[PDB]
Design a protein around this ligand. Sequence first.
Ligand SMILES: CN(C(=O)[C@H](Cc1cnc[nH]1)NC(=O)OCc1ccccc1)[C@@H](Cc1ccccc1)C(=O)N[C@@H](Cc1c[nH]c2ccccc12)C(=O)NO
Ligand SMILES: [Ca+2]
Ligand SMILES: [Zn+2]
Lengths: 323, 307
Amino acid sequence: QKDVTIKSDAPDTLLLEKHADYIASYGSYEYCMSEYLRMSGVYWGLTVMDLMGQLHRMNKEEILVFIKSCQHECGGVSASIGHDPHLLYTLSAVQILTLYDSIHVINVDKVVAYVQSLQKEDGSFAGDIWGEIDTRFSFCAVATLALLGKLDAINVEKAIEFVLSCMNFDGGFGCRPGSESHAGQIYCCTGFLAITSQLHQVNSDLLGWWLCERQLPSGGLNGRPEKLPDVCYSWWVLASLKIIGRLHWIDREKLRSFILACQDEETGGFADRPGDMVDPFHTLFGIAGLSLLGEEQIKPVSPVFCMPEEVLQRVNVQPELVS
Amino acid sequence: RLEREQKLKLYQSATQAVFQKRQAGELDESVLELTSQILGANPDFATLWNCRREVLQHLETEKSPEESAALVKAELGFLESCLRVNPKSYGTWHHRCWLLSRLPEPNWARELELCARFLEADERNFHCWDYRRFVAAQAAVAPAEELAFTDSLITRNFSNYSSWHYRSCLLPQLHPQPRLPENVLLKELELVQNAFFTDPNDQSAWFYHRWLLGAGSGRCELSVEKSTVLQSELESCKELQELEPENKWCLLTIILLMRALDPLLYEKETLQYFSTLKAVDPMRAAYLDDLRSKFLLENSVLKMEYA
Ligand SMILES: CN(C(=O)[C@H](Cc1cnc[nH]1)NC(=O)OCc1ccccc1)[C@@H](Cc1ccccc1)C(=O)N[C@@H](Cc1c[nH]c2ccccc12)C(=O)NO
Ligand SMILES: [Ca+2]
Ligand SMILES: [Zn+2]
């Protein structure tokens, strides 16, 4: 029922040049208030620029120095200088260094030791030393290790067992055992299962149905029943569908029109929904969504790592998907 | 605009102040003061929650039992005030869990009531449901009590996906096998059928019902009672189909019921319903074609089983 109504003067063409300009100029109120996620912000900007063929317009040397200064003695990476290390920003950092072929800018052995240290007896991962358990962190852990070639450093079978214990009646996954299904969690868990070669344990027809029912009459996707559509849930849902070989179960044209309607024609960037304020987070996920739908002007994107496939080919980390 | 310039400089200065105090090893109540002024508006600033925990951990070592209880009660109030402003912050909910998990004598009944209150405000807040499960476990609340809680929530109003989900997890606990019992299954079918005949637009009951249709013992194992109940559901859905010709959930459920009853006998009608459903729900045409293909393959295998 709850949906947006797209107006007939909503953008209907891809404004790539404007998007590159928007991201290229980003960070020249909200910028300073989101410093607690800065490393991820950098990842979103660099990844979308690379998908658009514009990575060179960002400042490689400056980012490499920032990343090195964010690695803590324990081996984990923080969101920004002086903040605390966390699996989230450790993954982001490693994704950035992978984009830039500069992994040895940081201490890889210590990254591995940090990730290893956060696994619990039941196979789960805490985000950091303070112990919050979430399947997001299972994904951060294996995605980080996969990119470093060190997946063997953790207890993989126990990690699999934990993630599978989070599978629900509807075929989806939540944060922890007993948690309700949510597209974000489904993306992390199907990504996790792709990396660890366990996609045969997903009920692809059941989960696939739950995911395609996220598409609303507007064409946009929500992240769970009864929520408004958003250009980013749209992404988690499509990547999950692609991983389980069911991308054709949504109406590609209606979704493409919804995503294009979220662009700001004046400033560039995408918003969560048409007419709203843009940001780099939704710009990445809007552009990434369009690539999965087969947009020629954008590089092919990995549904698992949300990085250009040509980068993953380079490091030879390409999980087999369902189809 | 100028006020945002005021707030920004206030957060900026408070932030620098906290970081400055932290390097110095000044783990004191001045940090609690500074972070309270930042975490209220910016609860997702996780490092500041970390700082509070370092301060509270430090202060309990060098203070009396009574002084530490006072700090903990002040923390519970601060957390509740933060939650009222933003009930969907991972950091705030985790700090409350961290806090309660280390208390000598935690009042779990009060925490369950906190959950009830927040679920009254937003019955879909997954952070609150997760917290409630945490409290229920810690306080050793039995699955039967929680099952009672979910029914009231489902009947008193809509927005039920989270409540049905919780039931799907609680029911297997009341009947733990190392696939529900039929008596339990029949009662659930009755409850969910009420739900979607009360609100046939509520997708959540239909999703849960599809699960119950799979949680049985098989079509050639259909008891007389279950056979009759499913046939009755089938006729009641056809009734609803008349009252709501655009309702896709009821059309899909009719197909699923015929599958549950007798795939080969209902093949004709199943194919007819696929055509109607695709007309009514065109965005799902590709899904429906694949489902129909899977069903036609199952039917070919059933026909080849003939002696
Ligand atoms: C912490 N985050 C959020 O809470 C957003 C909020 C939001 C999204 N759309 C409108 N508001 N929520 C969100 O990203 O949901 C993601 C998610 C992912 C996995 C499980 C559950 C939820 C967002 C950022 C944000 C904050 C505030 C407003 C907009 C964006 C965020 O950092 N998400 C993470 C999600 C994530 C976790 N693990 C990952 C691994 C690979 C890629 C992404 C992730 C991210 O993109 N990291 O690089
Ligand atoms: Ca450059
Ligand atoms: Zn979003």
